[PDB]
């Protein structure tokens, strides 16, 4: 299969952005999705355990919609790459990348 993302996206300072990825061309069960901002963990959506949000993003992330993540109160420090890491049963990994530019405002 393959992972499709919005690619390069823009958002206004103080606004919100929905980070989303779509896994296509595989019927394998998605067991977990991790979200990273650059090399830092934002959140984990595990099919059984739900949503883990890292303490530094607790007040700024709204889990979902679905396997996506809503990042709120954007600042210029949120500009950069984000990754969605899909885990598929039994042992697969698919990684998508999004580049966000936060504009002043």
């Amino acid at each position, epitope marked *: 299969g393959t992972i499709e993302t919005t690619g390069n996206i823009s958002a206004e300072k103080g606004g919100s952005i929905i980070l989303q990825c779509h896994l296509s061309s595989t019927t394998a069960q998605v*067991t*977990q999705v991790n979200w990273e901002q650059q090399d830092q*963990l934002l959140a*984990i959506c*595990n*099919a*059984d*355990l*739900g949503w*883990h*949000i*890292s*303490p*530094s993003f*607790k007040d700024r992330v709204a889990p979902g919609p679905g396997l996506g993540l809503t990042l709120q109160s954007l600042t210029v420090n949120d500009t950069g790459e984000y990754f969605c890491i899909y*885990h598929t049963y*039994p*042992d697969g*990994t698919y990684t998508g990348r999004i580049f966000l530019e936060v504009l002043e405002s």
Partner: antibody
Amino acid sequence: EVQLVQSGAEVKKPGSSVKVSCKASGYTFSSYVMHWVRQAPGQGLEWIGYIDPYNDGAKYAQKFQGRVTLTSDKSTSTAYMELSSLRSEDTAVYYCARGGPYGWYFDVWGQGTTVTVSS
Amino acid sequence: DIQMTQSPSSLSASVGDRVTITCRASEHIYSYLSWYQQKPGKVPKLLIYNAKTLAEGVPSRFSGSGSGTDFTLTISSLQPEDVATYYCQHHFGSPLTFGQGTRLEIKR
């Protein structure tokens, strides 16, 4: 330093319920979930569930779903574990353990609460 | 449910020995495995999370390795304070489950 201080030992009759508390200090209570894990005498560790104080969302192991309730009070930074319909096999040390920043592992543990279930 | 099989169940070692404990998961759990130390009559303590990341304050003689289904906890040079039971735990589904533990004692 982070500390989790649990309530004292409990002695309960079969069929009753027990409610244990876990008071957190030294960190922002709502930024981390609180898990519960128990250990029967001479046995291994068994996870019960967690409460997320940020949104009052609880997750339970299927083995305890419907018999345990996990709650939290942000005003006092306290988590609670209420286990009902107690049986002698529920005799164990019950720990609260903070969920770590990067996933579902247990990074800080309370001192434990002994619960004896007996007639 | 994901089952965790730890081996050996018990190990006798001398101070200064290299100790290896293994943990096998019944499903591929990527690097979502943590290790705990429990001294007798004491509370469990996190040693390693995410298969290889040392927890704060844990000495360098402890290291974790592996991924997928097979994981190892190594103590490079055993110290007397390392006498404990060690547990692995996956964190890739519900219920979160632990291995049955490895009891470490000093050989004499």
